């Protein structure tokens, strides 16, 4: 269970990184809407990761 939690935590970190890449891509794109979605996802994930 701990390993699964660690894997989930690792996945969350990877997911956050993917979201960050999208946010970086959005800045290059110049579209404000794409950037907004990425930011919301990062905050909830970080809180979940800390709890885990």
């Amino acid at each position: 269970a701990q390993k699964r939690s660690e894997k989930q935590y690792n996945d969350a970190q990877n997911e956050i990184n993917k979201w960050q890449r999208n946010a970086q891509l959005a800045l290059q794109k110049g579209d404000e809407n794409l950037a907004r979605q990425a930011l919301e996802r990062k905050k909830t994930y970080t809180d979940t990761s800390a709890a885990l």
Binding site: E32, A35, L39
Partner: peptide, 12 residues
């Protein structure tokens, strides 16, 4: 705030 941050990043 995020939009403002994005705008700041955009200018360079």
């Amino acid at each position: 705030d995020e939009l403002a941050a994005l705008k700041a990043q955009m200018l360079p």
